[model samples]
Target chain A: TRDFNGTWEMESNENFEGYMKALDIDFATRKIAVRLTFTDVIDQDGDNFKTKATSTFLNYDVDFTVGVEFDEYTKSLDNRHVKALVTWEGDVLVCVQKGEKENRGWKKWIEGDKLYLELTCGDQVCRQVFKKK
Target chain B: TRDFNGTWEMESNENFEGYMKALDIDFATRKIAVRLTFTDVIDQDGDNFKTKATSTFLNYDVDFTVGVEFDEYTKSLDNRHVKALVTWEGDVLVCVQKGEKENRGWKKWIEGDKLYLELTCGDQVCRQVFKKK
Candidate 1:
């Protein structure tokens, strides 16, 4: 069975500012982010569902069915386009994006009392942890 | 001089099923993702930043400093560990993740009025495109 469907809240942010700096984000963008609160809504009905993220500044929505291939837009960062596919590995959800970049995409799973996410773009890899609410 | 450090919208998705099938994702999980909407939050300050992908089913967050080395945990997908570093290639942000998968990771760049993302896992590659709003 799938183990990733549900609502989650962000408990803390680690080096979030530093990561933005690495992306060469402008000062104004940085200023706006420090105060932003993020929320996620996931609806999983067997092999098909929807994922949505809502915030004060912006909202993004991606709808996909398991084992299906879809196009994804990273409109906020790099603004690059990629073809992506989502599937389940055990209890985790795995997304693989294919495009011009090498070693791209991300993986999600839960551990003990936390949610773990790993994102890869080109050669850079970023890891973040969230306390489940 | 980077223009990819902010909030973006997902315009359209294509061919998401076949790609997932290639990843060997299970049938049950695939059924749960057909309708998921995905949102990404990106904050950039100089060379440090955070990128988050949130969905109703799962949420992923990553924070990193530009040109810094870090350990990344990919709980989903192949569930392999990697060492990664990020750098700039012109206006494009590039990252190289060293790990068990060869020719793995991704690249992000802008073209015309669309954002382009390329992801590679093992020998399989997926591409995605996003239109700006």
Candidate 2:
């Protein structure tokens, strides 16, 4: 299986504004977020994972273990708390976040040399692609 | 000039244990530290720099700017406070840490595709080489 364990730079983002709006993010924050690109710094050791989403404005970080549910606080975005569980679905990585929002989760997979992320909240989905740095 | 701006994996480490000993690291910590390899995740935007030294046991991180001195607390290694200054000498990036220790600093340079680091403290010098990940 292809494990995500490197520094990744964003190449493209789709529907990010709609996804932020689904999470009830403030207008000012969404305006700033939509204009910025993010870099993902990921470190994985077996089942443990540390992922960071960094931009010039702020950084969002999460640390969790596969198959283990942990409390996740989405800071600097919508400022919400959710119980998150990450699992491996074949070669794809999936995360299910149980919170106030419905169908909130993310799916990550790799194609060729590019990494892809699909973030879902309510009915909105944001697809982002990254390349290894 | 070239910038230190990428994820790097350690290829070789020389006399790192000796460098830790000079900083008066405890015996147990040294025993664990000497057995581990480190990864460097560096991000640079013009004069700003963020470098992270990561291992399975712990991580040491620093954020500084070129030609500017800042207070640095070297946590997890020697647990000491120092005033740090970073500058560029030609193609090499140099940092000088002034504190209780008489002579302490580091030099980083890129040669070919490899990055080389020389860490100095007192009479000990550790040379480490890394390759882009």
Candidate 3:
């Protein structure tokens, strides 16, 4: 069992701009979000997870139970309505977000003290790495 | 010293639909968001603050300095533009959002381990509570 209950700080962000563009995020917010460092706080109880991504200028978060599908409306990232579900493929937690955009989803897994988030939309896959604080 | 840094889980959302309607959120999204339990991951150091609100279906997040104003774009909740500021009035964290909408803003504070949020738009003020984990 992975103890994913901690504060995680952003170490690096890759392909964020492309991912945001795929969601049709406005240019104004996208630029700011690109530069700002982000934080993720995860409070998990078994498969139930609440992960929040925080930044100096913006925020995006989600709460869900594994294997249970729910409606997800991306707030600031890209205002889209999608059906989201989380499931464990062994140690990696995978999310499939079905919405207007194709190939949209995110995957998370922990490596040592580092946490990884791969955000996918269209052909863009934004890989984000965070270190536990 | 007040620490607004922690994970707060939503306990109840009162008049959230009314508040969303004031922001002109669509019917389908509004219906789904109202039922979600949100989580706030706050990391505050003095007047500078970062907050992320997480739900199973959507997310809304903001980061700002107390007494310093910045532009805020609410994506999924209302999808509007506003200039926002977060200030501390005694123990309460008060935010005044100036925008096209009439009388829009929110207030937050902590009582013990419980977090409280008061959201306003138009004539509706929605109250939401989250218990610390």
Candidate 1 chain A — worst ten consecutive residues by lDDT sum?
A: A56-65
Q: Which stretches of candidate 1 lie over 4 Å from their true place?
A: A1-55, B1-133
Question: What local lDDT does model 2 show for residue A37?
Answer: 71
Cα error of candidate 3 at position B71, Å:
23
In the range A1-133, model 3's lDDT, one tens digit per residue, is: 1333455554434455654554445665555456465454656564344556554543567889999999998865677899999999999999999978899999999999999999998999999999999
Higher-scoring candidate on lDDT, 1 or 3: 3
lDDT of 2 by residue, A1-133 (tens): 6599999988778999899999999765665676467889999999899999987433233555567788987542345688988777776668898987777787766565455556676556655554444
Docking class of 1: incorrect
Give a tens-digit lDDT track for model 3, residues B35-107: 3577899999999999898874334455555677888876633467889877767766678888776667777
Better of 2 and 3 by lDDT: 2
Sequence-dependent TM-score of model 3: 0.34
Q: What tier of docking accuracy does candidate 3 attain?
A: incorrect
- How should the candidates be ordered by lDDT, best one leading? 2, 3, 1
| TM-score of chain A, predicted model 3, versus the true chain A, to 2 decimals | 0.57
True-structure RMSD, every candidate: 23.2, 21.6, 18.9
Candidate 3 scores an iRMS of: 15.6
Candidate 1 vs 2: which has more lDDT: 2
DockQ of each: 0.02, 0.02, 0.04
